[PDB]
Amino acid sequence: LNHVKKVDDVTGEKVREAFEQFLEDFSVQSTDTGEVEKVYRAQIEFMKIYDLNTIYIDYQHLSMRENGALAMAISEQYYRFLPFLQKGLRRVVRKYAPERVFQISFFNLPTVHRIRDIRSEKIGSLLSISGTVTRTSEVRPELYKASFTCDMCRAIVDNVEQSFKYTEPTFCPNPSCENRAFWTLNVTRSRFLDWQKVRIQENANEIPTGSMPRTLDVILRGDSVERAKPGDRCKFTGVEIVVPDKPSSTLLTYKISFLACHVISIG
Amino acid sequence: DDDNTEIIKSFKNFILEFRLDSQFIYRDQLRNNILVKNYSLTVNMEHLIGYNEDIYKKLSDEPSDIIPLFETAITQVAKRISILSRNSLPTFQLILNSNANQIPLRDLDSEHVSKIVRLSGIIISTSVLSSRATYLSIMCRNCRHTTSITINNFTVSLPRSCNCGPDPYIIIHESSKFIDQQFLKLQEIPELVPVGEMPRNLTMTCDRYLTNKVIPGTRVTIVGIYSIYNSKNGVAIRTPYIKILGIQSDVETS
Amino acid sequence: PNVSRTIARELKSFLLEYTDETGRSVYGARIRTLGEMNSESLEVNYRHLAESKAILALFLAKCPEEMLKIFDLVAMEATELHYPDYARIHSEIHVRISDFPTIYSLRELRESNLSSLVRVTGVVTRRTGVFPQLKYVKFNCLLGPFFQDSNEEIRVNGEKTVYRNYQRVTLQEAPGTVPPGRLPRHREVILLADLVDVSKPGEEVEVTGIYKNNYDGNLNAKNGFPVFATIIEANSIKRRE
C-alpha cells in the first residue's frame, strides 16, 4: 500500500533552508582580526574531534540575519520545527562529514523570564528560566527511537516511537503483521539518551515573603545532563511543552513541565 | 498409576515385614498409636534404608510427590489393624526423625531445595493456629456438580469443568475435613555462626500432630523438606520455608 | 553467530597452555584450585586476556552478554579435560573476570554503557535476604525446559528445577569521594550464585557487573517519559582496593 503522499510543511521547509543557509553562511561580524570564517562550519569541524554529537549556536546571531523575522518562526512555533531542524542539520553534516544522535541547543536569549512570568502563550517556545535547583535525580535512559516488534511474530519493525507515551509500537503494521499481538519490547535495537530531572525553584531574593515560592519541573534531556548543581541558579533553553499527570478525549490532566536542552551555571 | 501401586505395595511390605528381633517395631508403633487416638507414625530412617535402599533413594529424590503415597500407604494398613469388617479413619501423619548430617542454617542455599534437610535452631515465636484443608466437598454455582476433592500435601486452584465459568465452584464447609497448621519461625543458634551479622530466620510450617509440640525459645532439631512459596511483596523472587516432618526436641525436653 | 564458535577454539588455547612468570600456567592452577575447593567460580584476569589479544578485550567492552555464555562452556570443557568429572558438580561455571578499567565510578554513567561490561565501586547499603530465583525449568512431562530469565519471565510448572540464589544489593557511592554540592546517587546491584553473601553492609565493594535496564519498570505515572530502570547485573565482588 503506497502512502500518497505527505503534507505540506510549507513554512517548515522555508525555515529548513533558512536555518541551513544560516548555519552554513556567516554569521560573521568581526573583520581583520577575527572571529571570521566561519564560525559554524568551523564549529562542526571542531566538533569532529570529540564527536560528542551536540552543537552550540547563538540566538543573537540567528536574529541578525532576517532582522529577527527568521527567529520568530523559531520562537513561538518552535516545537513544530524540531524534526526539521535535526534532519536538516544532518543534511548538512552528510555533505561535510562522515550512530547519529544530534542535540541542538540554542542559547543567549535576549531576555530572561522568571517562573512566575511563565504563561500558556510561551508554550512551544524558547524561554530562559533562572532559579535554584532542588531535588536532582539519577540519570536513566529515554526510549528515544525504538524497535518494538515483532509483534506477530517476525516483523522486526524499527521506527518512530519518539513521542512520550511510550505506547505503542506495532500499530499500522508490519506490512503486514496486523498486530495488535504483543507490543513487543526490544531494547537492543533502541538507542537511548540522557536524562536527569531537576526541580527548579525561584531565587529567594526576588520572592516577596510572605510568598511560598512555586517550584516547577525542568527535565534535562541532552548532553547538558549532569551540568546542574543543587543550591545554585541556572539558565536553561525553554521548550516549555506540557506533561500529563478539564475535557476528555472521546471516540486528560496536564501540567507545565519545562524542558531544557542547554544548561549554564550563570547566576 | 500402577507405579503408585508398586510404591505403596513396598511401603506396606515395609510396615508388615519389618523386624528388629523379634517384635515388629512399626506395626506395633501403629496399634499403640491408634489406641491412644494419636493417629500418627514415626519412621526411623536408618531402619528404612536398612530395609530397602531403593525407596529411600526415591524418597530423598522427590519427597513431596512420594511422601503422600506413603501416608495413604500406611493408613491403608491401619484399616486392616485397628478395625475389621466383612471408619472414619483419617490418613495418619508420619514423623521421621533421623541422624544424617546436620546442615546449618547459613549453609542452606538453593541446590538442596525439595531434598530432606535436618537442621538445628532456637525457635523464636510460634504463629497462631489456622486450618488448611484435607477433604472438602464442592458444588457448582450453576450445574451444581457435587465434587469431593481430596486435597493432599504438599497453592491448588479449583477445577473449572463439570458457561459454565470461569470458576463456578463453591466450598461446602458443612462437609469439609480440616487439619491444623502452625508456622514456627526459627533463629539459628547464637554459638554458630553469627560472626558479625544478625542470624537469619527460616519460616517453618508444622502441621497436624506436631503442632503446639514446641514452646518458643526451646532449642530443637527440625527435619522436614525444604521448599519455596510465592507471597507477593519481582522478579520472580520466591521466598524459602521449611515444611516439617517431623520435629524432635532436644533432650529431653518433655 | 556461528563464527563466534571459532573464537572458542582460540580462547581455550588461552585457557590452559598460556604461561606467565617463567612457566607454570596460572589458569591451569586456577582450574586445579576449583578444582579441589569446587567453589564453581573460575577466575580469569583481564590483564592477561588483553595481553594476548586486544580483539577479545574489545569484545568485553562491546558485547559481554553472549560471549560469557560462549566462554564459560569452554571453561567447563577445560575443567572436563583436567578433571574428567563435574557432570555431577554444578555443570556450570561462570567466570569472574577481574579488574576491567574503565573504572567509571558511579555518578558518571551514560547510555553508552548499556549491554557492555563496566566496573563500579562504592559502599554497600543493607541487602535483601537470599531468595531463590527460578532460573531453569524442568518437569516429568507431563513442553520441555524453558530458561527464564534475566529478568522478565514473559511470556509455571516445576518438577525438578535448578534454582540459583538471587540477591539484590543497593550500591551507594563512597562518601569520601563525593564532589561538593552533590548528592550520592546510587545504583541497584544483582548478585548471583556464589557472589551471594560475599557482601556486607557498611563496606566498600569493587564490582565488575554489566549494566542493564528493563523494563519501565515501573513509572509511566510520575516521569512524563519512557524511562527505564538502572540495574547492574553483577559479575565479581572484591573488597577495597
Curated annotation (Swiss-Prot), chain A:
It comes from the Eukaryota. The modification Phosphoserine is found at S211. It is found in: Nucleus. Present with 13400 molecules/cell in log phase SD medium. Early fractionation of eukaryotic MCM proteins yielded a variety of dimeric, trimeric and tetrameric complexes with unclear biological significance. Specifically a MCM467 subcomplex is shown to have in vitro helicase activity which is inhibited by the MCM2 subunit. The MCM2-7 hexamer is the proposed physiological active complex. Component of the MCM2-7 complex. The complex forms a toroidal hexameric ring with the proposed subunit order MCM2-MCM6-MCM4-MCM7-MCM3-MCM5; loaded onto DNA, forms a head-head double hexamer. Interacts with MCM10. Acts as a component of the MCM2-7 complex (MCM complex) which is the putative replicative helicase essential for 'once per cell cycle' DNA replication initiation and elongation in eukaryotic cells. The active ATPase sites in the MCM2-7 ring are formed through the interaction surfaces of two neighboring subunits such that a critical structure of a conserved arginine finger motif is provided in trans relative to the ATP-binding site of the Walker A box of the adjacent subunit. The six ATPase active sites, however, are likely to contribute differentially to the complex helicase activity. Belongs to the MCM family. This is DNA replication licensing factor MCM6. The gene is MCM6. The chain holds residues 97 to 463 of 1017 of the full protein.
From Swiss-Prot, chain B:
It is found in: Nucleus. It comes from the Eukaryota. Component of the MCM2-7 complex. The complex forms a toroidal hexameric ring with the proposed subunit order MCM2-MCM6-MCM4-MCM7-MCM3-MCM5; loaded onto DNA, forms a head-head double hexamer. Interacts with CSM1. Present with 10300 molecules/cell in log phase SD medium. Belongs to the MCM family. Acts as a component of the MCM2-7 complex (MCM complex) which is the putative replicative helicase essential for 'once per cell cycle' DNA replication initiation and elongation in eukaryotic cells. The active ATPase sites in the MCM2-7 ring are formed through the interaction surfaces of two neighboring subunits such that a critical structure of a conserved arginine finger motif is provided in trans relative to the ATP-binding site of the Walker A box of the adjacent subunit. This is Minichromosome maintenance protein 5. It comes from Saccharomyces cerevisiae (strain ATCC 204508 / S288c) (Baker's yeast). The gene is MCM5. The chain holds residues 21 to 340 of 775 of the full protein.
UniProtKB/Swiss-Prot annotation, chain C:
It is found in: Nucleus. It comes from the Eukaryota. Present with 1690 molecules/cell in log phase SD medium. Early fractionation of eukaryotic MCM proteins yielded a variety of dimeric, trimeric and tetrameric complexes with unclear biological significance. Specifically a MCM467 subcomplex is shown to have in vitro helicase activity which is inhibited by the MCM2 subunit. The MCM2-7 hexamer is the proposed physiological active complex. Component of the MCM2-7 complex. The complex forms a toroidal hexameric ring with the proposed subunit order MCM2-MCM6-MCM4-MCM7-MCM3-MCM5; loaded onto DNA, forms a head-head double hexamer. Acts as a component of the MCM2-7 complex (MCM complex) which is the putative replicative helicase essential for 'once per cell cycle' DNA replication initiation and elongation in eukaryotic cells. The active ATPase sites in the MCM2-7 ring are formed through the interaction surfaces of two neighboring subunits such that a critical structure of a conserved arginine finger motif is provided in trans relative to the ATP-binding site of the Walker A box of the adjacent subunit. Belongs to the MCM family. This is DNA replication licensing factor MCM2. The lineage of its organism: Eukaryota, Fungi, Dikarya, Ascomycota, Saccharomycotina. The chain holds residues 201 to 460 of 868 of the full protein.
